[model samples]
Structures are given as structure tokens and as C-alpha cells.
Target chain A: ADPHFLQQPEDMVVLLGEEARLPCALGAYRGLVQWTKDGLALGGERDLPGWSRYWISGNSASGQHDLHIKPVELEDEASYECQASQAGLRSRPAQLHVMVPHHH
Target chain B: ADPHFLQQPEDMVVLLGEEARLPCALGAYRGLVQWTKDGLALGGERDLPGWSRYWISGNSASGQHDLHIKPVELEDEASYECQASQAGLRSRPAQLHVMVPHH
Candidate 1:
């Protein structure tokens, strides 16, 4: 069966040096979910170039594939898209807005 | 145990509209081998952005994981890098050069 997205990752605003999770859920997935940021694939759950605080989370069966970043950096503020590699079913671009956390 | 590359994808030139295979082999692997093009991840084995004639081939257990491109185009000419996601074990940059098939 072709896959379908159950939940598209929503646009979120996060503070710099904080946690961020871009949720991308789907159903009837045959294989892995492809995650890309700014048109570049993130390798699902591996430490990417120039950043080690990156990985993928959630279960595929329950349709909870999410991209997580510990201490989201200024360079991480970009559009992210998730899709099923089996059927090419993709999610809407989720915009992650990063803000500078100024201490009081 | 950390993964080690047994064979690294080598730099090669291919005629346009021909097949191309970038071989990346490894040992002591536990998980998938990552494939990237020009420093951008290609999502292991799948149709990438702006290119459907793309996929990863070979047996990981046999320590062979390769990236294949059918009817390689001018855009296919670039530097490719592979690595093991488990240990971040990486292969040397393999450059794919494209040449015109002038009749």
C-alpha cells in the first residue's frame, strides 16, 4: 500500500541553544522515512555535517517520525520536509524559526 | 565495534547517458551506510531531489554498499561521500566526472 502522511510537521519557533523536534507522522509506510532540511537529506537520524546534535526519533508504525535537535543553532533555522521513500509521499515544509535566548 | 571501510568509492569519469556506480564497502557494520552527494545527504537509497535515477546498491553484510545512477547526466557529476551511520565511519570523497558522448 502507498504511504500517507498522518500529521505534517508544523511550523515552530524555538530558542537558540534549546531543544527542537519537527514532527512528521505517516501511515502504511513500507520502508524508512526520508528527512531533509532545506532541500538536503539529513540521513534520517545521524549526526550531520557541521552539527552533531541531530538525529531522528519516533516509531514508524505508529506514524511518529520526528527530527530532533538538541540545542538548536542559528544555522538550523530552515525548512524541513519528511517523506516516505517507498512512495515519495511528502509532508509540507515545516519552518523552524530560531530565536536568540537572551539571559536576564 | 566501529565500522571500517574495506573499499572506498574511487574517482572516475563516465560518458553522459551511461551507468555509474560509486562503490563504498565497509566491515564491522551494524546499521545502514550513509550516502551523500557534494556534502548533502542523499537519503541512503532513494530517488533524490531533481533526480529519480538514483539508489544505493550492494549488500551491507558483505560489506558492500554502493550508490548507483542510471543514465548519468551532467548534474550527476559531483563529489560523493559514504559513511557508516553507526560509528560515523566515512569513505574518501569519490568524484564522478561526466563526459559528453560525442558520436
Candidate 2:
């Protein structure tokens, strides 16, 4: 029952088609942690089926579960939540804003 | 520290375009529960975007987190796992088999 977040993910803006990363920190919880997009689970595999460009980078025991999305897309924009498997715990949702480049 | 399964979800087959339901039961655990598809999540919304024929049934406090999908489609067939938010606990994955009706 002693679970606390070390550092919650912060909102960020990323340019379209560029690599994007979201940092998530945890504390005092020795359980499996994961990321959720707009309230759905985000897989850890670097080559996820429909989410092939996404993956998490961190050591759960050390409380690091940062989320990385390569070549961020416009559809990638959504609310991301850092979640712990222990006690149904979650961090505040961080908004991922995507910006499209202007073509001359 | 007290968590157990009342009834784990079981693999089942469903006719395409028919109502499909996967039941999950829990006991001694008061934590939030959810369902996952091929390791991803299925939101609780009755009409989720890109996922319109899905929703969860039953009360969490009473240890029921059954998943129901209306008018199951061909693409709906996949591995499903009933998960508890507490302790990263999960039930043995259940397979959802979809069958196409013969004309």
C-alpha cells in the first residue's frame, strides 16, 4: 500500500513526423508500471502491431517508465497517463500536442 | 495483500455479427479491474472510438468485470486478458474466436 509517484509526466509539444519522448517517474512502488493513451494501454514492445513507433524506456525497479514515440504523428496527440499495476494507481494525464509543419 | 479470482475469463467462440461476452470474476480484491486485447487496452466506454461494439459490464466493488462486445466482427478475434489494477495481476489470457456464418 506504499505507492507514490516520483515524477509525473509533463505535457509537451512535438512537431509532426519527428521523434517524441514523454518522461514518467515513480517512487516507492515495486510493481509493473505502464503508459496509457487517452485511457488505453500502450504496449512496451518497440514494434507494437498498430503502435509500431512507440515504446517505453526505463527500469521499473528504479522508477523510470518514460514513453517514446518515434516520428510523432498528428493522430498521436492524446492524453497519456503513467500507471502502476499496484493498487490501480495512476499519475495525472499529460497532454501530447502535435504540430504540423507548414509547406511553402 | 488479499486478491484472488472469482472466475477467470475462458476462451470461447462467437458467430460473426453476434453479441459476444467474456466474463471475468474476482474475489477478495477491491481494486479497479480492466480488460486487454493482445496486450493493449479496451476502454470501458460503451461506444469507444475505433471500438464501437465494446463495453464492460458488472460492478467492481462486487467483483465483476465482465466484457461484452456487441455484433462481434471478424477482426474481433484475439487474445484477451482480465487484469487487476492492483499488483499488476492478470488472469490467464482467453482467446476470442470469431466464426463467419455460412450463406
Candidate 3:
């Protein structure tokens, strides 16, 4: 069966140097959940560029997966995707938009 | 102030030969909304390479913008982005992942 989603991640707009949270809500499938920024995979080590400002939270049991960005910057403005996969069946990607204010 | 979103588009999955609908929800901003697939901008004419299978719907007044794909195929399995802009502010991109099952 194909993986399905209960609550997909929504687009968000945040001010510069602000904290932002993106939520990925999946249902009843305990597989691999991954986060990607700008189409690049984010590893578990959190060693990627801008890792210092980004992290993930949430419990798979409840299907609540969240991506946290602290003090969102202008450069952090891009598309974020949350991917859930099980037995080669991948869920539709949940996307997040992080926007910055114009004063910076 | 930056343009904010009320309800952003969520990820979507569709079977081969099935139709998929992706929605983009914006809040309190009237400007321009654009849809891109695999990072390429989709123009107003819907004249892209796969335009035959794709189209956009929704009204800005209601803040409901949607993208539609018909008869999804393996080649259509890619990331879709919904971008909105007003004045100088832009909403976070809403992304959709179209998935096809493996036989």
C-alpha cells in the first residue's frame, strides 16, 4: 500500500532572526522520516551547512514530525520538505516556506 | 512586514494514471502566485514541457490556489513548489511530492 498522510506540513512565513517551526503530520506508518532543504537531504548528524540553526523534533508514534529553525535568516529562505517512506512507498512531501522581513 | 501564509500546500501522493491536486493557501495578501515543478517556473500560459498534464486552479480572493496533475506518470514524480509574492514579501514555498507505485 502507498504511504499516506494525515496532516501535511504547511507553508510558513517568519520574520528575519526569528524562530520558525514546520510540522509534518503522518499517520499509522512507522518508517523512515527525512528532512531536506532546497532538495538536499539532511542527515542525522546535523552537520550540514546551517545545521547550527536547524533541527528536528516530534514523535513518530504520534506521527508528529517537526522541523525547527531558530532565528530564521534571509539566507534560510527556501523550500523545506519532509519525506516519509516505508517499504519503498513514499509519502507526499510536506513543504515549508520560511520568509524574512524586509528591514534587514 | 512579510507576507504570511494561512494554510500552506501540503504534500500529495497519487497513483499512476490518477489525478493529483496540490493546494496553496495564503492569508491576507493579494499579489502573484506561481507554481514550479522541479525548480522550473510555470508560466501563465501553462506552456511548459508537461503542460498538457498540468494546470492551476483557485482564487486569490479566497486564498486557495491549487495545482492539478492528470494521469500522473513516473516522469511526473518530482517536487512541486507553490510560491506567492506581494509587494516585496513572499510566502514560504508550499511543496508537493507526487509519488507513483512500483509494480
Candidate 4:
């Protein structure tokens, strides 16, 4: 198990059409953050070549990296991960749970 | 831009609180499927050991791999990725645009 990787609020709850904050804190220096869905990289700071739905809130901030999902929806309900890695080391991994309102 | 990867409905339009199907068809997939949001892995087939929120619909379907998000919400409005791969070969990636009503 490597170090320098972290995620908070193991489980999160939110209402539909509301803003949700996916907490992802890292303890590494100069590491790349990769967000994957279902098992693939969704493209982020380091992997944003053909994507335009996600962005870095506060990059390069010690232990304060956050992934914001605007106008939350049902599709936003899933488990997310935060992979932190430096030039020579990689963190374990962070997990996020997006909770959405139950449809009527 | 390798090849053998695709995402259905380049741009999807779904109402809030509706069942949305994000189709992610693969060409050469023997590796694993992953779902990421906002530049992060949402924990899928290959990276699920302590998280549980999503599941595979059909495991042995040809060119019909689907990720279903039940009871849709606003938070689900984001771009998703569908990755396909073989043992020694990797294909291009597919993207899914989860559209939700503006809040």
C-alpha cells in the first residue's frame, strides 16, 4: 500500500439539481490526478485532451484538491476514485460515493 | 486515438429523475471497464475492493456494454468515459455526456 493518497467522506449525500463536492485530498508533491469512471479515465488536469465537463477547483493546494460536480443529477450517483501520484511515487487511492435523490 | 472504442449518443438528453443508459461499446476489450468523473476513477470492475455504487449490466454482450444509472439526478450531469482493451492491445476511448436539466 503506497502513501500520499487520500479521499474524504467515504460516503456523501446530496439532492438532485444541487451542487455536490467530491472531496479528494492527497499527501504528495507534484502528483497527477486521474479520475476514472466505471474503470476508465474521464480526463482531468493531466488527462484533458478531449474532455470539457470536468476541471480542477484548487490545483497545487496542499491536501485540498477537490472535484466539483455541478447541477447534480441521478447519473452522478456512483463511486469515484482519486489517484494521486508524483514523479517517483503514487498514493494508494481515494474513493467517493455520490448520493442522489430518489426518483418518484 | 488507437481504435475500437465508442460512446453512444455523443450528446444525451435525459430528464432529471429518469433512468439513463450510457452506452459504451468496445471493439477490443479483454482488459477491464472503468468509469471516471471529474478526472477521477469512480471505482469500477478493476478498481473495486472497498467501494460499491455501480455494477455491470451484461458481462458477455458483444458491442453492447452498458452502464445504467437508476433514478437519475442532477449530480449525474457530467462527462463519462468507456475504455476498451485486449490482452496486449488497447483501443481508443469512448465518452458519455450525461445531460440533465439546468437547475
Q: DockQ of each candidate's interface versus the true one?
A: 0.10, 0.06, 0.03, 0.09
Number of backbone collisions per candidate, in order? Answer: 0, 1, 1, 31
Q: What is the interface RMSD of candidate 4, in Å?
A: 9.6
Evaluation by lDDT, superior candidate among 1 and 2: 1
Candidates in descending DockQ order: 1, 4, 2, 3
Assign candidate 3 its CAPRI class: incorrect
The weakest ten consecutive residues by lDDT in model 2 chain A span A42-51
True contacts kept of each: 0.02, 0.05, 0.00, 0.17
lDDT: the better of candidates 2 and 3: 2
Please list the residue runs of candidate 1 whose C-alpha ends up more than 4 Å from where it truly belongs after superposition. Answer: A1-18, A22-32, A35-42, A45-66, A70-104, B45-52
lDDT tens digits, residues A12-41, model 1? Answer: 999998899888888777566767676555
TM-scores (chain A) of the candidates:
0.87, 0.87, 0.73, 0.64
Please write out the lDDT profile of model 2 over residues B19-88, one tens digit for every residue.
9889898888764567777655654332333355777777776878888899899888889888664434
| C-alpha TM-score for every candidate | 0.58, 0.52, 0.43, 0.42
For candidate 1, report its TM-score.
Answer: 0.58
Top model number, lDDT: 1
Q: State each model's CA lDDT, in order.
A: 0.74, 0.74, 0.59, 0.50
Best by TM-score: 1
Across residues A1-104, which tens digit of lDDT does each residue of candidate 3 receive? 44566766666677778888877767756655555566444432222233677776777678777777887877777676665522222334544455645664
What fraction of native interface contacts does model 4 preserve? 0.17
Clashing pairs in 3: A97-B92
Per-residue lDDT of model 2, residues A40-92, tens digit only: 56543323334567877777668788888997998899998877643356788
- Give the per-residue lDDT of model 1 (tens digit) for B29-63: 75656676765556665344434788777665687
